[PDB]
Amino acid sequence: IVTLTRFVMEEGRKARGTGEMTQLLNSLCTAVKAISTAVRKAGILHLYGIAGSTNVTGDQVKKLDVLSNDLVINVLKSSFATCVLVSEEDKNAIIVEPEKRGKYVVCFDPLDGSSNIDCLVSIGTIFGIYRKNSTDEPSEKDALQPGRNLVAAGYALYGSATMLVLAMVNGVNCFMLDPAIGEFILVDRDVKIKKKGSIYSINEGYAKEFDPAITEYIQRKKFPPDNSAPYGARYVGSMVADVHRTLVYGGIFMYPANKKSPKGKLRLLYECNPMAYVMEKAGGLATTGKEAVLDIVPTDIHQRAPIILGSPEDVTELLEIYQKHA
Amino acid sequence: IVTLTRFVMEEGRKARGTGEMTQLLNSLCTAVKAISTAVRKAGILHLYGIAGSTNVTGDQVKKLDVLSNDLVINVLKSSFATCVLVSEEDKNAIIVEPEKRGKYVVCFDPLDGSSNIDCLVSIGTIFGIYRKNSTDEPSEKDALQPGRNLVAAGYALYGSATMLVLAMVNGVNCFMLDPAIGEFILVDRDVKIKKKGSIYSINEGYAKEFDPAITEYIQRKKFPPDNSAPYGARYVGSMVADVHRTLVYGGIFMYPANKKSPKGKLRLLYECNPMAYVMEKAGGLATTGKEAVLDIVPTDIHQRAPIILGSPEDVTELLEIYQKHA
Amino acid sequence: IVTLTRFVMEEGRKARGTGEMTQLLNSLCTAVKAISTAVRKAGILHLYGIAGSTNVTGDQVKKLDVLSNDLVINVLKSSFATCVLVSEEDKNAIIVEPEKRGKYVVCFDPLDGSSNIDCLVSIGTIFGIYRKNSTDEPSEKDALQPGRNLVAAGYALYGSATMLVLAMVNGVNCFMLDPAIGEFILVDRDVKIKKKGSIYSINEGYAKEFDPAITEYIQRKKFPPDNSAPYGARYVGSMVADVHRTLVYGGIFMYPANKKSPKGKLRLLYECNPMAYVMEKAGGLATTGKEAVLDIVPTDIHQRAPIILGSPEDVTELLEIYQKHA
Amino acid sequence: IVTLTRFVMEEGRKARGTGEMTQLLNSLCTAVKAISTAVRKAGILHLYGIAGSTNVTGDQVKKLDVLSNDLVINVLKSSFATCVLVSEEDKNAIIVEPEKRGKYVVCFDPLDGSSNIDCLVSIGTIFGIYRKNSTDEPSEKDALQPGRNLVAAGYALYGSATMLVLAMVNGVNCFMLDPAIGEFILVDRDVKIKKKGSIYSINEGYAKEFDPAITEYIQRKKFPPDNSAPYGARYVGSMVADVHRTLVYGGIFMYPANKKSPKGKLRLLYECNPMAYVMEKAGGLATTGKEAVLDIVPTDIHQRAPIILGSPEDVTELLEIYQKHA
């Protein structure tokens, strides 16, 4: 009954916007549909495999990475709403030509879950939208803002069905892509996460590198002190899929710093901040274990950050352990 | 270049078949496409949620469960190739009317991964095909055959893309559904799994219930005695997704028996046997920890069985632990 | 490379618009995609047959008529860009609620070519957009403007492929719907019709009712006085299909007044005017035989008008006959 | 409820076939779906325009002609059911390699209605299936059989929706392609044409070349001697579209011989015979004006034939005129 286009229009309607943000979101939607279309038939299009390069964060690039990146970049430019773009696939920030230059700064992960591409596991796209604060000409510094400054954030999940999750000041809403008419349709309004869940999500293969706090927390999930039923475990391996499940089912998702990674693995700008924003707007929490992810002022567009997010009571319980060990 | 229909035709061509098996597989394909179509837009069709009942294995039934079950049952009957059908969603075996009765017995899980439906995580369909051995009229007993008697087995995975994996005496082949023309296209021929992988897949939330062998094995994956890099962990929560990843990336998938479940959770007839068959035809192994899954003679169409499967060297290493503890 | 959304955005960009017209066109596009989707599978949806009523212009209503009408009406209202709507399927003009009221008046034929629905012949949707000129509250009178006052007009043709043809002051552009991503893509820019064609389109079954001018013209197309090759004949029976062919191939389309129909059959507001506008913006002509269609000031929202349109030299030759007989 | 695959299977079931005919039809269906998919987005794929050559019947070849021809040829060969193939796009008959050689001879028009491609008017595919009668090795002579020897015939119409019309000894059935699941679904069973219609279909641009019989008949359709209402006229310009409308609405379709074309324009092997067969199985008639189309023994695989077909009473009335003039 309600398409994403109508929702965004009516929302900007009340926000008294000028339509620039509206255009931005609409363009982002088009890119997401094209990505979804290619993803659902990637093997037939021979889009699996490596492209032949490595990014700044040291990662083997895939064909879909390139395709999805080109699609997002091009639609964002043509939107006339952006001035600075930060992509996981690009060493430096992309400065938009004066002509099509807008007032928004967009940070995105064109295709998240690369390790799961070839095995057909859910993958997605992550984005964060900021309003240019500086007065100087557009530059990389304009993307170095704390997550708390986000005006919009979300992700597209290409799972059993394709979903676009959009978070803004008013809340989180979920839209599902109807492949037949090529429109995202509202299916979940003002989503709120459960106060406490029963699932913990983490790669336990790093057990030997985990700090005592994460170690203690996991042990508590398996052997509850109150003799309650142990939490179930889930780790798809694609941040977008694990976070979405955390959002709708509740629980906790973790990619903590460890002995070999002081700042964890996930990227602050286009992975952690967007999910932290979605999570907080849904009544959830997102922390590094010592500080709120959204309060971090970045100094590098590709910097990493540890991230623990999900149901408030679960995240808080883990925070109490870090404090107890601190 | 090669559709599933052509492959199956040319294969039965050499098998000197009469076309009954061919019809069966073609009908099964049609059901899978319809399921895939509904799955990709389930939320819009309002197919999420419970149907309002519980199966024999004690599980809350979902709307998609009913829809997918009806689709498979109906296409199998109309195929004129089956006589006995066993579904996870049906208390007793379904006996096909004399008119449309064929010589095949089909055991299937119309929709696997129910716990992951609402959160858009990959789900699928699993099937096993047997040739009626008895001489008596068709009955439930005809489905009580050991996996080693399988003539065909496989699964449909509704992940980032939809894939049909088919295993027969000649080997394992993967076909991807092209949504545009509605045809499954061969994308991976004679698939073989790696001798040794680097990923272990298990729900560690049951840590308190695991036997000493599984416990020791997991500890070894996290803290390798040869100081090699620890294995990475992955557990999507949908058997079809975890097994498919195990098939293409290698490694091990486990759903062992535990203190509260002597025979594990997964069902022998329509979950364990099919995956055990696919795995063995790909050069992999499938064991309960004490015996080959395919060698189990079932006494109940809905009986459970522990299952450990994947790369031969990984599965064998776990088997050595069970034997060491035995 | 260029979607309809981008084109309309960049065009309104230069037009210095406020975005209301842009929203209107985008909403109209969504309705057209939904209609196209239903049309391509109408028989399966059981959308063929009659709905059970007759319109003011005395015509048996079909199921698709109702569905397509509801879709256009609803998207136009939700666009926040319209105040008065005129549909072939509605006795009186529809006045939009103050809340979602905009400054545009839209006249449309939700589904043109009803006689060709059941036989799968091309059908379409026709629309004309006017800017409210009155100062009074919105009413039917606001739709009683001459075609020359059109700000935008066009049609969607559901033929071998689905095309959206949009004409505005700057010219005529054609966009084709890509079923895979659900986006209209620019395929023909600034379309111009040939000065002279070689095809005449008319229902010759009315031969006994035609005036001497039409009669003489047809005879000339079959037996050219200069001994040139006779014109070929084409009459699909759906105005949208015949006019589109006239636009791209050139020639003439005719639905003249006759002994039993002083004002012909086609409706001025939502059939003749839009096509007359598209035709004139493409360098073509549209006449009743005695006056320019676009210069007619209507007195009834459902009034009819004779229409002769197409290549200038062909239409002019017919006009010379009417004048010769006058 | 009933897919084309099931229908053909159950029909061959009763026919006691060996499955070769079944395979043939299934392969033909796959080609038709692929063609339909390309057609619905031809402009975006840049499939419009000429390929760069002329066929034996002297016609400018289009890109879609080549693509559709390659698709049909390849699927027919891979079917293992054919030995001799005759295509409008091929100078000589195609002899199938011994390996994939079957017992059927297929004559087809891969894409009919070329003149209507660029203007998005309905187009289609036409096919006729014969059983090899000769005992010698497969050759062109095996395709030189009279239409009355047809075992199956039909066409795919890519109109507002895509329809596959299949005629066999038991009757005519219509299947509509559901783009979502990529399956043809039965929508019209045992179709029968009306005894008398009210529409005549012919290119009147050839008025100066028509024989006195056709001339007299047209005059009678416009000025009925019994003062009944004149017949309506329709001529889409694509044989597949005009014949399908004739089949479902009744009436008459004509492409007669004329002063410059003793044998008309349409091709006997892959245009006239198939439609003549469909028409006769539906209770209709197909004549050259002097003899039954199906009784013509061809001497050239690309020979032409005049054709008058449709409702028995209409075709008979025209036959009475030819006889009256004879």
Ligand SMILES: Nc1ncnc2c1ncn2[C@@H]1O[C@H](COP(=O)(O)O)[C@@H](O)[C@H]1O
């Ligand atoms: N579609 C929308 N939904 C929600 N808030 C919006 C929307 N459009 C604009 N806004 C808000 O209005 C501000 C200015 O919008 P704009 O003038 O389009 O750049 C944005 O930064 C948002 O805070």
Ligand SMILES: Nc1ncnc2c1ncn2[C@@H]1O[C@H](COP(=O)(O)O)[C@@H](O)[C@H]1O
């Ligand atoms: N399409 C096929 N692919 C592989 N093996 C086949 C196929 N069709 C038949 N077979 C083999 O031939 C046996 C008899 O086939 P059928 O006569 O169709 O029941 C089956 O049980 C298989 O072992």
Ligand SMILES: Nc1ncnc2c1ncn2[C@@H]1O[C@H](COP(=O)(O)O)[C@@H](O)[C@H]1O
């Ligand atoms: N997308 C557009 N393309 C072309 N002209 C436009 C567009 N948007 C607005 N205009 C022109 O600007 C006028 C005012 O637009 P608006 O303020 O959106 O109602 C319209 O009546 C058109 O003449």
Ligand SMILES: Nc1ncnc2c1ncn2[C@@H]1O[C@H](COP(=O)(O)O)[C@@H](O)[C@H]1O
């Ligand atoms: N699917 C079918 N529908 C109708 N008739 C069929 C079918 N299959 C076979 N037949 C008839 O049986 C004959 C032999 O079929 P086959 O052995 O498959 O070549 C054909 O020439 C038809 O007359």
Ligand SMILES: O=P(O)(O)OC[C@H]1O[C@](O)(CO)[C@@H](O)[C@@H]1O
């Ligand atoms: O294999 P690991 O170390 O658990 O990394 C998984 C994480 O990496 C990412 O693929 C990013 O590279 C995330 O999508 C996912 O959460």
Ligand SMILES: O=P(O)(O)OC[C@H]1O[C@](O)(CO)[C@@H](O)[C@@H]1O
């Ligand atoms: O939540 P658990 O106990 O890990 O169960 C997960 C397993 O259950 C199933 O959903 C079957 O019920 C499998 O698809 C999956 O492997």
Ligand SMILES: O=P(O)(O)OC[C@H]1O[C@](O)(CO)[C@@H](O)[C@@H]1O
């Ligand atoms: O059957 P007739 O009188 O030629 O009418 C055909 C015309 O009628 C319409 O269907 C409108 O009713 C047009 O689409 C078409 O041009």
Ligand SMILES: O=P(O)(O)OC[C@H]1O[C@](O)(CO)[C@@H](O)[C@@H]1O
């Ligand atoms: O333009 P003409 O001479 O009427 O030819 C139309 C006929 O030609 C064809 O395109 C075949 O060439 C048929 O599809 C159609 O019936």
Ligand SMILES: [Mg+2]
């Ligand atoms: Mg990522």
Ligand SMILES: [Mg+2]
């Ligand atoms: Mg990425």
Ligand SMILES: [Mg+2]
């Ligand atoms: Mg299951």
Ligand SMILES: [Mg+2]
């Ligand atoms: Mg199940």
Ligand SMILES: [Mg+2]
């Ligand atoms: Mg109309």
Ligand SMILES: [Mg+2]
């Ligand atoms: Mg209408």
Ligand SMILES: [Mg+2]
């Ligand atoms: Mg033809």
Ligand SMILES: [Mg+2]
């Ligand atoms: Mg042709």
